[model samples]
Target: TLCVTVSSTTDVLIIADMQVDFLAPGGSLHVKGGEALLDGINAVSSQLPFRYQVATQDWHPENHCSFVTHGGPWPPHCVQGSAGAQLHAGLHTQRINAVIRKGVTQQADSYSAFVEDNGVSTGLAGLLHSIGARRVFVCGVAYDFCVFFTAMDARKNGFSVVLLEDLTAAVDDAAWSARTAELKDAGVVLLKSSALVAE
Candidate 1:
């Protein structure tokens, strides 16, 4: 279960990019065993002491850069409004208070839920602050990409960030490990689900 204890501040639950294409087999860019995180996400959501739970969906159009098909047919995946773009099954989606769509624009890829690839802010920082969220716990598919960047940006935005290791998987193992070390150096807390508790 998800538990965040902080003095006079609420926590935010952020589920990033657990879209169908990323979780399902034969996806253009699949995360290994990505489907495994669903149960943990559901568990954490069930214990939502926080007022808001937001989910970030990688909703990309057919022409988006992330789609290899557009860049010369690598593999078709995550086309907006398609089956692949939808959230995976058993995600406890009803608990999600809001869905933030990223990579909607055709030209670029949006790996980070907090910002586009070109570094434009997605305004998620403001939303977290508005909701009185001083700390955030993030988990989702493909740790090396979206999850990692999200944690980094969350820390930069002055929110205490924790990356739930058991709830996240990665594409590039080397990059993921290096980035994890980098995040730790930058002061982001990395913890397992077993340690999650509210004081």
Candidate 2:
């Protein structure tokens, strides 16, 4: 229930990796409220004053190291150019000003939208800066992985960040709660999307 003030200039809305592999039924790593998150995300985006809206997609090759299939098959998910790699059908894909694709390499795993797990730059922070965004409101799939990493990166890069808590879901509830506390401790704001008005 953190109260965050969303300013039009400094804030951008980022939906982290809400792709078909995470949101649709029978997806690779489906979250409980995946489709529901899409509805909420769309509503927020439609009403927000910010022009910079982004949605992340996990566009990994079938042989990605992160996939157990490479060494072992870990559920067959998010394969590049496959139906699994597409964005969620419920999301307003056209409203997204940018679509960041991650985990494209067959040899590496990328869990964060801000930076690849290998520390390769996704140019997310630079994109935000170039557009004069000093703060970001983050939401979307797997709270423990992409959402958490994106928030940490936003803090590391000196941007004020707010996680729209209710709009996100996680694989590990305990881990996500712990990570949420860590974000608060690091000065990343945690807010409920319900608290904001359509501006």
TM-scores, each model vs. reference:
0.89, 0.92
Model 2: lDDT of residue 169: 91
Candidates in order have lDDT scores of 0.80, 0.80
**Model 2 stretches astray by more than 4 angstroms:** 1-5, 71-74
lDDT of 1 at 50: 57
Q: Per-residue lDDT tens digits of candidate 2, residues 178-197?
A: 89788889898778898765
- Show where candidate 1 strays beyond 4 Å: 1-9, 70-74
Compared with the true structure, model 2 gives a TM-score of 0.92
Candidate 2 residue-wise lDDT at 94: 69
What digit string (tens of lDDT, one per residue) describes model 1 on residues 80-154? 889888888768887787889887787767777888877777878889899788888889977888898888888
Clashing pairs in 2: 68-72, 68-73, 69-72, 69-73
Candidate 1 local lDDT, residue 68: 62
